[PDB]
């Protein structure tokens, strides 16, 4: 190996932390 430190892995942020929903429900994004 020769490159810089890999600090963080690939990370698929699935629906467990993919918030939305209450995002528009609190930000008043209209019907």
């Amino acid at each position: 190996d020769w490159s810089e430190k890999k600090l963080f892995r690939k990370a698929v942020v699935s629906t467990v932390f993919a918030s939305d929903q209450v995002a528009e429900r609190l930000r008043q994004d209209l019907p």
Binding site: F8, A11, V13, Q21, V22, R25, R27, Q28, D29
Partner: protein
Amino acid sequence: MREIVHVQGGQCGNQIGAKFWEVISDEHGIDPTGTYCGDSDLQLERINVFYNEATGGRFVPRAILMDLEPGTMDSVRAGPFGQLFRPDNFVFGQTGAGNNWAKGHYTEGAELIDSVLDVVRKEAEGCDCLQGFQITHSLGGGTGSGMGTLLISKVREEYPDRIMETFSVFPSPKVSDTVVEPYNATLSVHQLVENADEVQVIDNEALYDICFRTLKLTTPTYGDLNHLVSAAMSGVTCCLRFPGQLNSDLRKLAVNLIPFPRLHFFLIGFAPLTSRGSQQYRALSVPELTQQMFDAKNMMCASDPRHGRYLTASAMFRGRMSTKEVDEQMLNVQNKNSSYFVEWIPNNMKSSVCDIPPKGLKMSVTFVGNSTAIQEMFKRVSDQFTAMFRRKAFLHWYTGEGMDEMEFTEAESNMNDLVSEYQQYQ
């Protein structure tokens, strides 16, 4: 100006703090690369409270992301609004707490708290004058309670005069993952009661309750729950960064609510919170906002308000409104609800106004409340703690790394001292 140093402790703290940095970044118009948009004076004139200039026109959050397992913050960088944080500010663990208070506090947290303090004083000393340290963590998880509260205690002796505000999320009775729930909760509160100026309590079952009964939300996710807490997490700090006709600061809330120093545990709430079919049908005004304010189902803490007396309470409004409809709506709720308010204090209500509403909302408010009816969570945590303690269950994972038997006993002695102190103020 005055600086707030955020620390995200544990897996819970990292996730709820990441949503806090997202809800404050769009609040300040910050591009997720780090730049600015929105062309307004009033936003960036006080942005140093949570951000630092990085000699390139980008604003780095003053956030200390940490826990003992690298698998948590590896996901928040790849998520949105994650590359704003400084990578060297991230401090890692390698072994991870085994879901316990003791391997957090004593064994694997002592050699990491040296580097944690160094990056805290990296941020604290670099400014002229600092307001307080703000820490989001959980009182049910291993690294969120073990050396999370050790970080709370150890920063006190160097910085005792700045305010010490923390958000703590407690285990839930009806849904019990994280199998050692009361051992982490009881044995962290007895240390968090004397080394923290102000602690706000959150229960996950209450955050679930606001999803079903109020929002009519079908499937609530963990990231959604972190946005519920992030709404009043930014609402408690609106006037710290934005102007107002009646100001509010973190020391303003601390001095004006708790009458006694050992009592520093609060409820919280956020209004308005509408549902899918009730945006354009529900009025948004101060008289209705106070009725949703003092709603038992509105509370994000599962300690019941109407089973006891409100010692004090606070309602910090947000937006453009008339401030004496803020005032008289505090008056009349004390008028109709006399038994729900404590009798040896007239005018339990403190109110203030931040002039900047949250985006898209004309008007909002946050609750910083102080009830003596927080006992139903205290005795419920305490009696499962004594349930597993009298039969000596799951003690081998705790006492095998240099703990005496008397720390649990004095943790319970502090625990029922809190119960007895609060019960005699009925």
